[PDB]
Amino acid sequence: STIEEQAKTFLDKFNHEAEDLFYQSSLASWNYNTNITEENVQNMNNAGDKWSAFLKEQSTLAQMYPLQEIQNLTVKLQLQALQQNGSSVLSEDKSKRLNTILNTMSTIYSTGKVCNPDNPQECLLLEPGLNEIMANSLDYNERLWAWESWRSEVGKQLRPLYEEYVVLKNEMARANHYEDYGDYWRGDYEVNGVDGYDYSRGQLIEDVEHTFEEIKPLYEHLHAYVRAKLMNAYPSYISPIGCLPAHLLGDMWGRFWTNLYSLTVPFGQKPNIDVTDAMVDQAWDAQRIFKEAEKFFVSVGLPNMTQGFWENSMLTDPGNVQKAVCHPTAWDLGKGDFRILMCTKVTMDDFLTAHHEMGHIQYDMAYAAQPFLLRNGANEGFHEAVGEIMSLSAATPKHLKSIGLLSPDFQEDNETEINFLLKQALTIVGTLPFTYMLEKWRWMVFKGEIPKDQWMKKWWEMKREIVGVVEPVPHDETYCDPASLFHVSNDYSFIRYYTRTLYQFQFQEALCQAAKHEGPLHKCDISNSTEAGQKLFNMLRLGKSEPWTLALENVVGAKNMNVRPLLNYFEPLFTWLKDQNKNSFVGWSTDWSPYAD
């Protein structure tokens, strides 16, 4: 009778149709990804097309019930998710133009190549060629050549496309009554109509900026320590008061500073924990690795894996006859079918990755009873936050001793912990100014605050000011250096890596408290704590049926993103950095550059 009762019946029909159509698609996608054949690309495309067509038809249909006349909020959440027409609010001509632009930028990125200035037939792609240079080379000029020629050969191609992408995406977003495409992206965090849990799209800007201010002193000190270490190794290339040259950061963008570890390691003769040899000594295999991770989750009160998981997952490289896509992924196919795909090696890295991916599965199993559309993380940052904390616990010396991979005669001390925290900070803290700065620039481009003729000028001013990184070669507006990173040229939002990073330390802090952990937060292992498992499970089973602010509060007692646990985690390194830096300049002047003499 009423509009809500009809929407309920419509969703009732959608859920049952969607489950089966999504299941076929996932199944066809699975057979391609474990067995790369031309026939399988085809089945994968057809079943995905059916699923895409089903959604467009159901989206149109869902728009005939106005949310304005729906009071039940979970009905309202589902209808709204299905109603977001997205691109189909543009004219067909603009949609086709946009999808063509998207496609071209994507293939420019994945097929873009540079050839060395001596041999026009010997070329490198980004992956593996340029990435191997930017992660491994110590040679200043090789790194400079890779950095610059990536941005001038492929970035210049992306520039005109990116300009037209911004125009069309903004048209798309305004037609859906957002103020621009960045505001559209910030929609992931919006909560309306739940008293004491609402969250506006603009509020995300303020909380990212406020939490970032509190991160700056840790980052300034990390930056100053890293600059001093690099200056010792490159004395004629680095100013003691300047920004870090962008091509000296350990990958193609300085997205993570992970690969600076060999040049910056504090206590360079202390042994690093690597249980790989011990796994090989005890003849572990992939099966044992995943059995151990299962044991980890069972120890905190969470279910074991389903029988189908063990039967249907692909946990080792399937030999050489069939080729597989070996990037580790957790699959939620629907209908109680959960799988991990991973070409597992007998290494500590893959041992930790397995706990990470199985955390995804554990999240997927917990919200499987939610209606189809609410089967997801509470927001874009939750799934990855959940995966990360599992590797935190699994890697600690306590846990590695507990499972017999680390000798009890292993000696943890001051220095090995500072080593570990610095390696952690290079990756985790190093990416936070990078991530904030990149998204801020996109948010301002989408908002219209950066004219086209200052795109690159503003990009490099914000790199120098916010990130403390300076370009080694001047770039005019024929470049599009943002787009030389995957997420920009492939149309993915980036703030998720910032929010995820804060969430994970909030979770870990809460769970380690519930586990009664004594000592510095980075040493905590939540193993054997059913109190920790329950507190996590109370959020996991929510999916996205509740506001993310409430889902967060279930675990950590607060309703918002908070930096304090991240700083708490890094406090032992902070005080050590501050002491190390007593004879250094802390901070950076932005006018120095490698090419200005």
Added chain:
Amino acid sequence: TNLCPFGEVFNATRFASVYAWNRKRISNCVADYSVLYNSASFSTFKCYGVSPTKLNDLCFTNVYADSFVIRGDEVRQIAPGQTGKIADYNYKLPDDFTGCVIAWNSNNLDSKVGGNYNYLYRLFRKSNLKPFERDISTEIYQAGSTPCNGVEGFNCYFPLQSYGFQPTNGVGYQPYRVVVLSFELLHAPATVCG
């Protein structure tokens, strides 16, 4: 003194869809209810009213054996006082139910790669079923006010949806064969004993 034909109900090659649940009347025969219990091949065998061990020492005028296929997660609705799509729209047990409910996993027979769509269930109905009622209509369900004129459209859904049984589903989604035994007493002689 002939044996009750339970093998043809339990070992049928193909079961009914639950919306069109099959009923077999059992009469004038001798039934060994403790070979059924002591098979150790059923995941569910919950009698409501008297123990199997004890009802093998009993006589009834008529026994009914209803059989059908549902999802693993739905077997719990084959019990008195349950709600859900099966209990409300397909097969409804009364409150004072006195028979037995048997079920087992039939993933090996009732699912196949690419999907077995043979089995259907009723997704919508204007109201709930009375106990032991059966509805096999295929009338388009009018969810709105505009009539349907016998075709699917906005607010007009075909009322029967198919299960899609693939062998790789989870146990909650796998097919389960179900036999329900109803025992009745009347004024006529008791033609079923053990």
